[PDB]
Structures are given as structure tokens and as C-alpha cells.
Amino acid sequence: VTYVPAQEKNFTTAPAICHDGKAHFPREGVFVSNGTHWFVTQRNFYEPQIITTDNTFVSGNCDVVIGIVNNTVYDPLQPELDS
Amino acid sequence: QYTSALLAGTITSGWTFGAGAALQIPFAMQMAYRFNGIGVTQNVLYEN
């Protein structure tokens, strides 16, 4: 019993996402885009999610990694401090 | 012509060319995959 993927679809990638001046790296999965917003899905399947601090890992600055892009990283603690 | 074909999937297509249909994988994302199997995070690849 084997697991074979079938149909493919081409998306836009990036190694890192720059937010506050520090580079973010994916903990699990890859960075994809539909042409408007950057989505975080896993490697073997397409399940797009919002960019979170639990799914991403932060090290270094943004002047190192070639191909880094700028987007916002959603923090769930920030609406909890404002409510 | 076999070795030119199977180095064309090893450099570009990743490991997924023999396990199914070939995906489109950049080469800078392949070493981010292959360091994670031996326990090395992506901090080591992109800085060095």
C-alpha cells in the first residue's frame, strides 16, 4: 500500500520572511504564496495557514539570507493584551 | 543518458521524482530539507 501524490500546482516560495528586522524560518513546512499573501503549509500536502510564532522560528537579522521577503507575523498574544 | 536524467532530478526535483511525479523544488530549499533529517536546523545553511 503506497502513497502517491497526483496533481500539482505551481506556487511562489521564499526561504525567509522578514518582520521586525529579524529573520523568521519555518519550523515545520514551507512558505507558499498565491500571488497576494504568504501562506504557511506543510511539504507533502497543501493546507494554508496564517503566519504564527508557533509555526515559525526566529534567528539572525534580515541582511544575511538571500531571497527574504517582508510580511507581517501574527501574534495571538497581541489581541489578548488589548482585550 | 540515464545518468544525465537522474542527476537532473537529484539537483532540481529533489527526492520526489522516483516516489511519484516530479515537483518543482529550488536548490536552496533542498539543503534546508536534507539538514533536517540529520538533526541540523536551517540556521546553519542560510548564514554559512
Side-chain angles (χ1 to χ4, degrees), chain B residues 17-48:
Chain B
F17 66 97
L23 299 175
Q24 186 171 357
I25 300 171
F27 180 75
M29 295 300 294
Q30 291 184 341
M31 294 182 286
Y33 301 148
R34 293 181 181 273
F35 285 162
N36 289 335
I38 61 173
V40 178
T41 67
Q42 297 176 337
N43 297 333
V44 182
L45 175 66
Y46 294 138
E47 294 178 350
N48 291 336

Side-chain angles (χ1 to χ4, degrees), chain A residues 8 10 25-26 30 43 57 59, chain B residues 21-24 33 36 42-43:
Chain A
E8 298 175 353
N10 290 337
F25 292 154
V30 294
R43 299 178 184 172
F57 180 76
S59 178
Chain B
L23 299 175
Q24 186 171 357
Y33 301 148
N36 289 335
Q42 297 176 337
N43 297 333

